[PDB]
């Protein structure tokens, strides 16, 4: 599980 | 599971 | 599962 | 499952 | 399943 | 599990 | 588990 | 477990 | 367990 | 660009 | 760019 | 860029 | 850039 | 940049 | 930059 | 920069 | 910079 | 800089 916000 | 917002 | 918003 | 919005 | 909006 | 906000 | 905010 | 805020 | 704030 | 092999 | 092999 | 092998 | 092997 | 091997 | 091997 | 081996 | 081996 | 071996 990988979650990224930029 | 990969979730990305840019 | 891959979900991407740009 | 791949979902993409640009 | 592949869903794309540009 | 990896979660990143920049 | 890795969680990063910059 | 690694948690970082900068 | 590693927790860092800068 | 989306490329998938199963 | 999304590339997946299963 | 997202690349996944399972 | 996200690269995952399982 | 996120790179994971399991 | 996050790199993980398990 | 976070690097982890288990 | 965080580097961990277990 | 944090470096840990167990």
Residue numbers in the entry:
A (entry chain A), B (entry chain A), C (entry chain A), D (entry chain A), E (entry chain A), F (entry chain A), ...: 1 to 6
Paper text:
High expression of PSMαs, which are four peptides of about 20-residues in length, increases virulence potential of methicillin-resistant S. aureus (MRSA). Amyloid aggregation plays roles in PSM activities in S. aureus. In the present study, we investigated the structure-function relationships of PSMαs and their short truncations.
To obtain atomic-level insights into the architecture of PSMα1 and PSMα4 fibrils, we computationally identified their amyloidogenic spine segments, and determined their high-resolution structures by means of X-ray microcrystallography. Segments PSMα1-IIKVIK and PSMα4-IIKIIK, both of which are conserved within naturally occurring PSM truncations, adopt the canonical cross-β fibril architecture, wherein pairs of β-sheets tightly mate through a dry interface, forming a steric zipper. Proline substitutions in these spine regions abolished fibril formation of the full-length PSMα1 and PSMα4. Structural indicators of fibril stability of the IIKVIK and IIKIIK segments, i.e., buried surface area and shape complementarity between sheets, calculated from the crystal structures, resemble those of eukaryotic steric-zipper structures. Specifically, the steric-zipper segment PSMα1-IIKVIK showed a peak at 1621 cm−1 corresponding to rigid cross-β amyloid fibrils, in accordance with the crystal structure. While PSMα3 forms cross-α fibrils and enhances toxicity against human cells, PSMα1 and PSMα4 form cross-β fibrils which likely play a role in stabilizing the biofilm matrix. The highly stable steric zipper structures, forming the spines of the cross-β fibrils, putatively serve as the building block cementing the biofilm and creating the rigidity that can explain the resistance of amyloid-containing biofilms. The atomic structures of the PSMα1 and PSMα4 derivatives offer templates for the design of anti-biofilm compounds.
